[PDB]
Design a protein around this ligand. Structure first.
Ligand code: ATP
Ligand code: ATP
Ligand code: ATP
Ligand code: MG
Ligand code: MG
Ligand code: MG
Lengths: 476, 56, 471, 470
């Protein structure tokens, strides 16, 4: 039959006897009204994981089979609401009023159902857009140590997506609830919430819901994706998902591994991250795109969980604490940060203006190490040491201040072709702001051409505009 | 010049004596960190092995 | 029969068989009261808390007092509820154990006074309130580099003997006098000597009338130490919600909550993880620390001391608690042995209140410029360890001179240090702390020697301390 | 004679055959169920026998997800191992682990020959070991570790270092000329690179001479292990029966070793070393000892090997080093300096760098470069603490030349057209020897060092300097 009875209850895991027709991955309902998922099926004992408060489930209480595989609610009504991993409203404001459901154990788009990344995702941060570019359908890793700029790069991205017909999801895994309310108030102030969905799994919840939260978040976005509209997803910590499943697998007594992690860490993270794709024109041309985050102890790139995730993604942005405390914010190490799709995900102008800057900012970083040990140097090295210092200052940018792409290409054009060489290093940040003002009042034609064509205007005209501003400037 | 060259050679010699003494002290301090790290790595691997063996 | 029998004993843990169909809930409390019926046997009073339903009508219960003297076949009664702690105005001025009993020898709490449970669900998303204003402690390093926040969580990390408790006593002295509100002091894993010393300090002050104290100390069995933090917080939760008063909660050692759970866990039938810890570390810590929050009804500020097992910040229990805290100061052994009191790491410590709008642009520009000078000198340190400062050139020389000035001018004289060093203490207001750093950063005090910058409060004090030397 | 499921433990399943007619290790089993009621889910599954337990019961590893599996279902015994289409039908197509065509191009007929994936390895009576040199056009490989035609080639590296961007460069150069079949076996790789390669092969026209087996990162572990063996049975048929020479490209053979671990605990095996299977060497040997060039015909085999945690002292790489003929190790420190391809010129080795296998002039120059770069390594410690000006004229001249040699090992590839703008170059071997000899003899030392980065021939370096103004 479809009824069983609980025999062991402890720590969010239970064991039932009976329930003979259950499937792996089913939903099961206890008497209290708390729901559960079956993950193991021995000959006499069904193994069930509890998705709610377990302080009311006693031994010998009944458990009954729903008949459904694990399903997350989807629909247009979820947009602008704060929700649980299960489809349950949290912000107050009443029901979510969804229409249909999707499995959380979907198959990924297969080879021959996907296309190449060819359209940009303009974040509005100079370093990310110029050096480590992001396009629609890419998976991109923000990796770093505590307090380095990870959440801020993710939220600044959502804010600078208002014009495009984008839908964004923010999944908060393991975060203290006060912080999530702070993020939501921040989005509401910048007007971002109108096109976003927030999914919350606070540190007080059973670890199973932490484990289900990322899957629920992609399950919600793929609905839009197969319908054609583009979507972005952010996972606040995948290192806290790894902890949550370590705990669950240790309670279900599966043997340990490297450290105490199971071996099924690679499977867990790949299952999640390979549902991100760019579908082809037959599928209607939608796009998901994904932003995992990963925190590393000692700020170290070489470790188990960091290297596993650095294998599944289509790039990385590694943020360093010594850069951050040394005045470079956003603190991005250009040597360790790479994009595996970089080059196609840029407008034609930015490809021409800024194609090899990332390799160039790595040569400067290495040569600087050598010359701190070289005493006197020659002319070709002093020239390249100058351009490198000027570049690291043009890459600096304060919090909650977006720069449009047309302005990014013009300041990077001055840097690459030598116009910023005369300006002392201290004035490079000031020269940037004055240049944006001058460009808006006078140079509407050059920006018009960039918005119109996605290409660079005639060199003589650009040289004329920039040289004229260099006459107007006043320097220390 | 006689006094200048004589004084330059003596200055390098003590600077070299003190530099060598600082380096040798750092070698004993670093060596102990390596031995403490080596003994911890050999007690972790044996506890993970025995933890899986006790379960199975 | 709702009575049960004991079937097994394993240190802190016990196993109690009950009648079929009548088992306790999973955080429910039990009672053993036994009178010796023969010379061999001994008499007992004990209470226990349910933790797992193990099958065969059995339950596994951790214990709140020592299990020495238990016999299998003893009879166990069921309270029907979680551990219930007396709450209301009657708590003020009193010293308590985990069971709720008064240990102050001033009487016993009237049996009709309302007692509420220890284990209750955490506060909802609709209720929580987020705001920022700055709390002023007069301690230089906190006020510039990592400012504390009203209504937040404040955490003080450090290893054995590195200065956590003296900084807590300085905070009690300044803030609880200025607070105008209720306080709770809760001691999990602390000496039973420091409990008495603090009690006499509070009675002599007259501050006792507005505060309540729970103690469970290093000597107590592992079980009692876990539930003591939860006990202190149910009293504090009544003061924030039903009286509506703002509250301070001070916790003496929160590491001992994780440590105690580790000992009992292996004995409950659980497999290990990481450095021998429990397999439920994140959930157990988070269940306690999510309750300690500001709400629409009122606010709690918690100042917590976190032990680090060795001077190693990679350990599993410290690392998880870093994710829960709004403002954090890390105390380092190296600095303490050099003579820098308090021993705060200027670059590792963080706060959410360091933002132009909250602090003002002058404070923000001064704090960031100080942290940039200190990071350059943490890289120069690798070369000056061997060669000395002959290798350094130009900017390297000027940066090391100013870093030496800054690192000694973050050290202060405390009123609580008077029991150790004969000097008087100093309180430095925030507007004064920022002005001094700027004159050091400009270079206006380049001439004065480094030994005049140690253990002082304001820049005027450095000038008179230099003039005493004449150097 | 049918069977019944008893335990479903994630990836592993257990089946009891009551009659006593049990299957055999490596055999394949079928689960085909149509849903009786609305609650159930339709299932189509293949499973492979791993172990015989006691109570008439067999452990099996699945080749699809065990979602929707219910205790008591029916398992049909094929009586054979997994069988794969082999023949001219394979050419131009993409297949799954079971030989079912993934591509929309069509469906293979049931009249076609199929061969079994498992087979004993070739024997000492009929292996062979002649040496020739395979030209690649990549400066580092062509000088310091020449690939040997008909022999095993290994690219070792940690995450994000340059391994797949090499395989694609070798596929542009070697594929068209080296007439004969090419097989691609993508074990544990992204599905964004599988799609890109299919269109790259369709563009050039290499497809008619190719067959592909793809198993991506998201499959159940069992499918990831048996994807290497599927590619190998196809290449073996072309080597032995047709007799044409053949190329094999296997991407991430570490993902084969890693899968075994995941299934080891649920199979009932005790753990060994750093959480690895108690049978690591034994599985690596069975697979690798089949990939050989016999008296009948030659397989050149080119592999990417993943160094599990940036630790070359790990068991899986250490066990792998014993099987190769030529090896290039990729290092992240070089990739941080921007020297691409990031190949260790000391840790990379080949059996073809022998004075008679490559010539006296080649060998002289190669070992002399390796002395210069080992001398630069020890000298960097002295420079980092004491400073470069402190040292002798011979020490200064070593550092001078070693900087230039290390940057001149970098090269502009055609697959780096997307990553670096510039189009790309092919350097013939004779040219590479001339140029490296000039650097060592000091003729070009007047030029500034930045001119040697990402250039192909030494002629180009002279012009690149002219633009700088020297
Ligand atoms: N571009 C920037 N300029 C200046 N300050 C910045 C910039 N970006 C971030 N910050 C500051 O750096 C810190 C980053 O905090 P944030 O919460 O974003 O980091 P995090 O790594 O997510 O922290 P946690 O590890 O607690 O999650 C804050 O002080 C933030 O205001
Ligand atoms: N501000 C200070 N000025 C001078 N001495 C201090 C100061 N703070 C601490 N000390 C000295 O250092 C020690 C600090 O003792 P304290 O109890 O605060 O350490 P602790 O870290 O709390 O110890 P434990 O880790 O055992 O709980 C004592 O020896 C004390 O005299
Ligand atoms: N030859 C090259 N020229 C220029 N850039 C390169 C070159 N090789 C690699 N890169 C850069 O480094 C990245 C490395 O990507 P690659 O595919 O080689 O990683 P990988 O070693 O295959 O990773 P995995 O081990 O997961 O397969 C490229 O996407 C590009 O940014
Ligand atoms: Mg964050
Ligand atoms: Mg103390
Ligand atoms: Mg690859």
């Amino acid at each position: 039959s479809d009824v069983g009875t609980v025999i062991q209850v402890g720590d969010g895991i239970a064991r039932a006897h009976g329930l003979d027709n259950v499937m792996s991955g089913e939903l099961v309902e206890f008497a209290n009204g708390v729901m559960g998922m079956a993950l193991n099926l021995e000959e006499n004992n069904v193994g069930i994981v509890i998705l709610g408060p377990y302080t009311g489930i006693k031994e010998g209480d009944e458990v009954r089979r729903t008949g459904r595989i694990m399903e997350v609610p989807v629909g247009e009504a979820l947009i602008g609401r704060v929700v649980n991993p299960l489809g349950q409203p949290v912000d107050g404001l009443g029901p979510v009023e969804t229409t249909e459901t999707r499995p959380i154990e979907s198959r990924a788009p297969g080879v021959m159902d996907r296309r190449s990344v060819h359209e940009p995702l303009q974040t509005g941060i100079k370093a990310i857009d110029a050096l480590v570019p992001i396009g629609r359908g890419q998976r991109e890793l923000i990796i770093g140590d505590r307090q380095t700029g990870k959440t801020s790069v993710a939220i600044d991205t959502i804010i600078n997506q208002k014009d495009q017909n984008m839908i964004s999801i923010y999944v908060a895994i393991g975060q203290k609830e006060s912080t999530v309310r702070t993020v939501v108030e921040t989005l509401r102030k910048h007007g971002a919430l109108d096109y976003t969905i927030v999914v919350t799994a606070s540190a007080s919840q059973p670890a199973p819901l932490l484990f289900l939260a990322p899957y629920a978040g992609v399950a919600m976005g793929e609905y839009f994706m197969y319908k054609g509209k583009h979507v972005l997803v952010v996972y606040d910590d995948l290192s806290k998902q790894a902890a949550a499943y370590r705990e669950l697998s240790l309670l279900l007594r599966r043997p340990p591994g490297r450290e105490a992690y199971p071996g099924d860490i690679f499977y867990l993270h790949s299952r999640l991250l390979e549902r991100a794709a760019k579908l082809s024109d037959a599928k209607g041309g939608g796009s998901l795109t994904a932003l995992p985050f990963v925190e590393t102890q000692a700020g170290d790139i070489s470790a188990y969980i960091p290297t596993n995730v650095i294998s599944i993604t289509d790039g990385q942005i590694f943020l360093q604490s010594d850069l951050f405390f040394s005045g470079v914010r956003p603190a991005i190490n250009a040597g360790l940060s790479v994009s595996r799709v970089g080059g196609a995900a840029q407008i034609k102008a930015m490809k021409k203006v800024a194609g090899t800057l990332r390799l160039d900012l790595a040569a400067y970083r290495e040569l600087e190490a050598f010359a701190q040990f070289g005493s006197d140097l020659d002319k070709a090295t002093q020239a390249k040491l100058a351009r490198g210092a000027r570049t690291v200052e043009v890459l600096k940018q304060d919090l909650h201040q977006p720069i449009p792409v047309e302005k990014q290409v013009l300041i990077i054009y001055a840097l690459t072709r030598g116009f910023l060489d005369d300006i002392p290093v201290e004035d490079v940040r000031r020269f940037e702001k004055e240049f944006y003002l001058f460009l808006d009042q006078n140079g509407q034609h050059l920006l018009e051409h960039i918005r119109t064509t996605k290409d660079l205007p005639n060199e003589d005209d650009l040289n004329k505009a920039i040289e004229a501003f260099k006459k107007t400037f006043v320097v220390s | 010049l006689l006094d200048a060259k004589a004084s330059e050679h003596a200055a390098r010699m003590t600077a070299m004596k003190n530099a060598t003494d600082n380096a040798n002290e750092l070698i004993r301090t670093l060596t102990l960190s390596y031995n403490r790290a080596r003994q911890a790595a050999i007690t972790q691997e044996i506890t993970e092995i025995v933890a899986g063996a006790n379960a199975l | 029969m709702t009575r049960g029998r004991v079937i097994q004993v394993m240190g802190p843990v016990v196993d109690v068989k009950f009648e079929n169909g009548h088992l306790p809930a999973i955080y429910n409390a039990l009672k053993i009261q036994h009178k010796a019926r023969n010379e061999n046997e001994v008499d007992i009073d004990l209470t226990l808390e349910v933790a797992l339903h193990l099958g065969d009508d059995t339950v596994r219960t951790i214990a709140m007092a020592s299990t020495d003297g238990l016999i299998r076949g003893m009879e166990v009664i069921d309270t029907g509820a979680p551990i219930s702690v007396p709450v209301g105005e009657v708590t003020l001025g009193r010293v308590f154990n985990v069971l709720g009993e008064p240990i102050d020898l001033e009487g016993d709490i009237p049996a009709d006074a309302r007692r509420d449970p220890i284990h209750r669900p955490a506060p909802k998303f609709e209720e929580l309130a987020t705001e920022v204003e700055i709390l002023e402690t007069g301690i230089k390093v906190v006020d510039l580099l990592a400012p504390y926040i009203k209504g937040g969580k404040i955490g003080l990390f450090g290893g054995a003997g590195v200065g956590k408790t003296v900084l807590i006593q300085e905070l009690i002295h300044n803030i609880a006098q200025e607070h105008g509100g209720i306080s709770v002091f809760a001691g999990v894993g602390d000496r039973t000597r420091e409990g008495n010393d603090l009690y006499h300090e509070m009675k002599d002050s007259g501050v006792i009338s507005k505060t309540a104290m729970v103690f469970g100390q290093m000597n107590e069995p592992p079980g009692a130490r876990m539930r003591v933090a939860l006990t202190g917080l149910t009293m504090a939760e009544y003061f924030r919600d039903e009286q509506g008063q703002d509250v301070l909660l001070f916790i003496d050692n929160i590491f001992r909550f994780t440590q105690a759970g580790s000992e009992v866990s292996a004995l409950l039938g659980r497999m290990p993880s990481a450095v021998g810890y429990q397999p439920t570390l994140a959930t157990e810590m988070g269940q306690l620390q999510e309750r300690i929050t500001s709400t629409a009804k009122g606010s709690i500020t918690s100042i917590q001391a976190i032990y680090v097992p060795a001077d190693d910040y990679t350990d599993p229990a410290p690392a998880t608690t870093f994710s829960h805290l709004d403002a954090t100061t890390n105390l380092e052994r190296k600095l303490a042995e050099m003579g820098i009191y308090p021993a705060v790491d200027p670059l590792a410590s963080t706060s959410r209140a360091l933002a132009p709008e909250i602090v003002g642009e002058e404070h923000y520009q001064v704090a960031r410029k100080v942290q940039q000078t200190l990071q350059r000198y943490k890289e120069l340190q690798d070369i000056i360890a061997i060669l000395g400062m002959d290798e350094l050139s130009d900017e390297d020389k000027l940066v090391v001179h100013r870093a030496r000035r800054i690192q000694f001018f973050l050290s202060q004289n405390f009123h609580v240090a008077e029991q150790f060093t004969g000097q008087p203490g100093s309180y430095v207001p925030v507007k004064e702390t920022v002005r001094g750093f700027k004159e050091i950063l400009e270079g206006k005090y380049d001439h004065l020697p480094e030994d005049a910058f140690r253990l002082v409060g304001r820049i005027e004090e450095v000038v008179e301390k230099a003039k005493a030397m004449g150097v």
